[PDB]
Design a protein around this ligand. Structure first.
Ligand code: ATP
Ligand code: ATP
Ligand code: ADP
Ligand code: ADP
Ligand code: MG
Ligand code: MG
Lengths: 502, 502
């Protein structure tokens, strides 16, 4: 018909909101019931709600549905906004007086309803008067659409007002396979598509797209082919799209609910070298925890804590573990996102990230430098309590309806966290120590291409008796080598720096 | 065509935004796609965005693009602002009814979009109504322009609304070389430009100029030549713009993203003498770091801490290191800039400086008297936490897209910084001591030309057993010597002053 991926939500709507309209009024009045005048649809944007609303009416051959926007009403002058509501229902009032109860069905669509409640009341009262009060009108059917159900006051959900509610979900694999066919029907119908394109492969490559994203993907793929000929020319009739066009167009559309690849990849990883036996164990534990949350239905929430001294390599390990998992959804919260905001904005952003995290089969969240997010300074001590409470409540909530996520958080102030008494929110703890032997330094120098062995041996020979038990991190060790490489006497300068660092 | 240095951006814009308009409607209807209606361009000011818009306008032979300014509408009265937006789309609406889908293209330009969000809702809602609502027009194409992308909320970036986004960068060598030719074509083609002028040299001398600065440079150069034939005619046949005029004009136009030469040179430096080996060591270390930052891909962020007793001479060393580097971009933040402002003003100033720092291939930043910027007083103790957190966050963020900068900060309260546990933000530390030996005093005496060798040795021979172990800084020594110079008996005054100094 034009819709795809919605089959158990199409029957439920039709059974209740439209089944009684088909039969003649005689039998309906014989039973002694009344028609429904409300319907609510909620879900993420770009999923196909207005499409359902417009497509359903075609079966009943009703009038073209009118459309109104909440912010449109809010932004106008007070008097005009007050007057518009009565103007909206004029034709329905006229038709009822004209033709009694045998009038045709009229549909009114109200979009972005929640905006009215976000702070207005005149609009709500006038709207409810036409459908519940003694001015009851028996021709209308109102459709409501919101992205947040929890903001709608319970007064509107009692019987007689918006009596039926439905939810729309992101499409699954079969939904995407159907949507691709629906979108490319006309293109295929005119022999303008190559025969080497397989829609099954595309159904799997596009992993977490919504309905709207596929349209843009197809449009970009078509544009790729169109631009191939211009500069207006002959033989346009031989135009054809190809698999390579789709593959290249896949690089221009980045979906929401996707991977923030740029940050995790560049900002967080500038090398990775195995210099000790502890790193392998840490990575193996990370891989095991990743596997546990993909093949088990008794664990839908796992949280960790990676602590240690400063400049040890926590964030790089967390990012490395996250990158190799392969989950569709990955995000991180770090101080760089929250710089320059006010407290309320920070709370709103933190809440919104978690709220968006509850709409995918699998998810991963990273929380970097927890002690900085709270503005901790030991002189007072001074810190923000509201953010701490929000994080404490959030780190233990379970996602709804058989969904699962994995949280990894880093810190360097273990004692401070122990004082605040929020150490019971975590399921396990991992420690990252410093370097404490010359063999690890030798491995690091070898793997960084410092210089030939003849020069490498001398540094260790001198440091053996100059400083036996140095205790330095990896981040500073990788910085000393870089600056010593540029000196005129690298061998002595590296030892001089390392002695001070210890 | 008229624009130089933006080939790839031009190709990307043309492929997506305008390609679909060339083909006849039949094939486009055959494919089953729709034309795009949005395009966003962002970058630094004075780079050639509206020039690109105008130049693209002529190829399709569309109507002359309208231009509207954000502040103009925003500041105007409420009623007039609400009413005047409808005036903009009148012609496009009329043409649609007149000629169906065969109508010509109409381009509308919206300038300074972000200004609407900096606080307006009615304008945005009305604008979106014409391109996303049921009253959509198929002839329009809206161009947006902004300098800060972060301020635009995500709601406007989803498919259907502004859908394609592009960035504009400052020109490089070849860009300036092409722009010079484009600007001086008319002078060259009329035998009004001397043959001794070489454009390649000017392309390399101007190191961080944008498009408009070159226009200004050419205008100043032409004015220089024009002014030499007044106090009058008969020179209107042998009028040429020689090379000297351009070199003189180079000293008249100062670009943004340049060097604040006066502040670094005059106020901060008032002498530099080598009275010890440690000074040479410090200078050599500074040079080593400077040349490290320039020739590496692993290190794109280096921060140092220079500390010592009060009056040791810290700021002069940092200024001397900065001046000898030769980088295109240099700036400093000191209490003098933030005097007389409120807290929010200081935060905004720091944020703007750091944001500006991230738009050049190479950069340097100086921060002077860190403990003073926070308003530290030890009686309470009382200090500002917001500025401290902002600075702590800002000292770790890395520049985007393969760029690099070097930060140098000075302080005299090392213990206080240790108490605030912000010593992990720095990669290396350098300590500057005072003077504690007589040979250094003799060296400064020699360098400052205080007196002949006789009195110079006499003063040392007296202070050898008058006071062997004084402890004084350079700043106070060079103020005592100066006041001793202008007395009638320098030796007796200066020996007593220096003995008291200890
Ligand atoms: N095996 C390794 N483990 C960890 N880090 C490594 C390893 N090999 C190389 N590195 C480098 O170590 C550097 C450590 O930087 P990183 O951002 O992880 O520090 P950090 O511990 O988060 O610092 P801070 O505590 O100051 O926030 C990374 O840039 C990475 O390139
Ligand atoms: N080799 C030198 N090193 C440092 N300062 C020198 C040297 N030769 C001369 N000077 C003079 O030392 C003076 C003191 O330096 P400066 O003005 O930077 O003081 P400061 O350490 O920043 O002061 P304060 O601690 O009060 O902030 C400078 O005016 C400079 O002219
Ligand atoms: N489930 C779906 N099946 C087919 N097409 C869809 C679906 N969802 C969205 N689309 C396409 O996306 C376009 C935009 O949908 P839209 O009206 O924005 O839905 P909503 O606004 O309710 O999210 C429509 O023209 C439609 O063709
Ligand atoms: N890439 C370029 N090539 C040639 N001239 C340029 C370029 N960019 C800017 N200019 C010149 O700078 C002048 C001002 O540019 P302007 O239209 O103000 O750009 P913007 O509106 O983006 O600041 C123009 O008259 C133009 O001649
Ligand atoms: Mg970290
Ligand atoms: Mg100073």
């Amino acid at each position: 018909l034009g819709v795809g991926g919605l089959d158990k939500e199409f029957t439920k709507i039709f059974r209740r909101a439209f089944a009684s309209r088909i039969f003649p009024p005689s039998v309906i009045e014989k039973l002694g019931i009344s028609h429904v005048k409300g319907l609510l649809l909620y879900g993420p944007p770009g999923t196909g709600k207005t499409l359902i609303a417009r497509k359903i009416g075609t079966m009943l051959n009703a009038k073209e549905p009118k459309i109104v926007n909440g912010p449109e009403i809010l932004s106008k002058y007070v008097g005009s906004s007050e007057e518009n509501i009565r103007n909206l229902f004029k034709d329905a009032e006229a038709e009822y007086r004209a033709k009694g109860e045998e009038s045709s069905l009229h549909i009114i669509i109200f979009d972005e309803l929640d905006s009215v409640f976000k702070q207005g009341d005149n609009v709500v009262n006038q709207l409810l008067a036409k459908m519940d009060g003694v001015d009851q009108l028996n021709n209308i059917l109102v459709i409501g659409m919101t992205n947040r159900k929890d903001l709608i006051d319970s007064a509107l959900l009692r019987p007689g007002r918006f009596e039926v509610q439905v939810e729309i979900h992101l499409p699954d694999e079969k939904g995407r396979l159907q949507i691709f066919d629906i979108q490319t029907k006309k293109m295929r119908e005119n022999n303008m598509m190559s025969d080497d394109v397989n829609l099954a492969e595309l159904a799997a490559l596009t992993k977490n797209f919504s309905g709207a994203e596929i349209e843009g993907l197809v449009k970009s793929a078509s544009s790729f082919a169109i631009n191939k000929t211009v500069n207006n020319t002959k033989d346009i009739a031989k135009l054809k799209v190809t698999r390579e066009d789709f593959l290249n167009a896949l690089n221009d559309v980045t979906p929401a609910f996707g991977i923030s690849e740029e940050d995790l990849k560049t900002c967080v990883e500038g090398g990775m070298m195995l210099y000790s036996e502890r790193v392998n164990s840490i990575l193996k534990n990370g891989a095991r925890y990743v596997r546990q949350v993909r093949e088990s239905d008794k664990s839908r929430l796992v949280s960790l804590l990676i602590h240690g001294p400063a400049g040890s390599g926590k964030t790089a390990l967390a990012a490395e573990i996250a990158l190799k998992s392969g989950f569709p959804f990955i995000r991180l919260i770090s101080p760089n996102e929250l710089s320059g905001m006010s407290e309320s904005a920070k709370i709103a952003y933190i809440d919104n990230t978690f709220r968006d995290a509850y709409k995918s089969p699998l998810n991963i969240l990273v929380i970097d430098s927890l002690e900085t997010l709270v503005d901790w300074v030991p002189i007072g001590p001074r810190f923000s309590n509201n953010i701490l409470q929000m994080l404490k409540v959030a780190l233990k909530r379970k996602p709804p309806q058989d969904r699962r996520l994995l949280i990894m958080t880093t810190t360097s102030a273990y004692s401070v966290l122990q004082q605040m008494d929020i150490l019971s929110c975590f399921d396990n703890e991992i420690a990252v120590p410093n370097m404490t032997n010359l063999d690890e330094l030798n491995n690091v120098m070898i793997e960084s291409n410092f210089l030939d062995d003849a020069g490498r041996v001398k540094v260790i020979n001198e440091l053996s008796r100059s400083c036996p038990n140095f205790n330095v991190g990896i981040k500073k060790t990788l910085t000393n080598i870089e600056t010593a490489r540029h000196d005129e006497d690298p061998v002595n300068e590296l030892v001089e720096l390392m002695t001070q660092s210890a």
